[PDB]
Design a protein around this ligand. Structure first.
Ligand SMILES: CN1C(=S)S[C@@H](NO)C1(C)C
Ligand SMILES: [Cl-]
Ligand SMILES: [Cl-]
Ligand SMILES: [Cl-]
Ligand SMILES: [Cl-]
Ligand SMILES: [Mn+2]
Length: 340
């Protein structure tokens, strides 16, 4: 039967099933006030699927100049054409190669650039903004979005949305690498998975994806979405409560020291955006500091709600197109205040 919601992470994560249900706020606001992330499924079914394809981005915008990042070593690939990224998104035989002659796992940096999404892609902008879930929180002018209503004593988010485009991580070695390293934002955010590209050529990399989800600490109900319903998994997230941010900083200062980094005792390893918590580091966080997080698999059309101040990291399983919008909920406005 169709139901309003279900639970993941063994009851610790709300999963809303109908993105446009006018009663979602009633269930949402109880979990959100406690500092929890929330998942909303089915957003892909609300969108115009032809506007979110890698081949369309390449055809319409392919002559723009951009920088890429090599996800394996953080090397920057400067001043290439954006088609050089899009044409290898699913076809592995078309990817830019490293010296070792392997196809690279690439992230497209800052594209569209700064606040230019709405100017560059007005039709995509409309399709996304009109179908965001929890619209009183997430729309630019929603009644529960304080972004447009706050004085300069608060850090205000940039005008969005922002697009996040990157290939999937492939190998056993890749399991310890991030697509986006551990960091935090002083605003709330909603992150929507609008396209998942399962590649071809080196296409059969399905079994390393299962070992990554399993070692990533995903719950048994999350594993049933693949095996029983054949949904497409895009990315593995780990999210931590805002109240645990300082304990994470203490762990990363101890590890930086053990690895012979030479860091002042007060430096901020979360703001530096230099760490990915692999299986070894997640277990140490739990055992040595008492900190548990949420392991979330974001499938096609899942919207991940990330609370202000909550540390988080992202590991692409397959090639992903994500679009995210920032907002300022009244529950979490304390995180962007500039005093005490
Ligand atoms: C989030 N979620 C479950 S858990 S099962 C899956 N149906 O395949 C649905 C209802 C979308
Ligand atoms: Cl909070
Ligand atoms: Cl457009
Ligand atoms: Cl709402
Ligand atoms: Cl990063
Ligand atoms: Mn973020």
């Amino acid at each position: 039967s169709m139901t309003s919601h279900s639970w993941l992470c063994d009851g610790r994560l709300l999963c809303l099933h109908d993105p446009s249900n006018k009663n979602n706020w009633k269930i949402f606001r109880e979990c959100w006030k406690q500092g929890q992330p929330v998942l909303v499924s089915g957003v892909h079914k609300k969108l115009k699927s032809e506007l979110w394809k890698p081949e369309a981005f390449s055809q319409e915008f392919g002559d723009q100049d951009v920088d890429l990042v090599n996800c394996r070593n953080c090397a920057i690939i400067s001043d290439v054409k954006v088609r050089d990224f899009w044409d290898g998104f699913e076809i592995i035989c078309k990817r830019l190669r490293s010296e070792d002659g392997q196809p690279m796992v690439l992230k497209l940096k800052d594209w569209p650039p700064g606040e230019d999404f709405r100017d560059m892609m007005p039709t995509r902008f409309e399709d996304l903004m009109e179908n965001l879930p929890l619209p009183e929180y997430t729309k630019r002018d929603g009644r529960l979005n304080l972004a447009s209503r706050l004085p300069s004593y608060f850090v205000r988010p940039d005008l969005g949305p922002k697009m996040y485009n990157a290939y999937g991580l492939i190998t056993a070695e890749d399991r310890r690498v991030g697509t986006t390293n551990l960091h935090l934002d002083v605003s709330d955010a909603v992150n929507v998975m609008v396209y998942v590209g399962i590649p071809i050529g080196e296409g059969a990399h399905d079994e390393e994806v299962l070992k990554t989800i399993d070692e990533g600490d995903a719950d048994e109900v999350t594993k049933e979405r693949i095996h029983d319903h054949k949904e497409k998994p895009g990315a593995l997230w780990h999210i931590y409560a805002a109240k645990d941010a300082e304990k994470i900083r203490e762990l990363l200062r101890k590890v930086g020291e053990e690895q012979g980094q030479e860091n002042p005792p007060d430096h901020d390893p979360i703001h530096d955006q230099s760490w990915y918590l692999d299986q070894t580091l997640r277990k140490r966080l739990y055992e040595e500091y008492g900190v548990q997080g949420w392991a979330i698999v974001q499938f096609l059309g899942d919207a991940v709600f990330i609370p202000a101040g909550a540390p988080h990291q992202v590991h692409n399983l397959y090639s992903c197109i994500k679009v995210a919008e920032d907002f300022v909920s009244p529950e979490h406005v304390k995180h962007c205040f500039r005093l005490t």
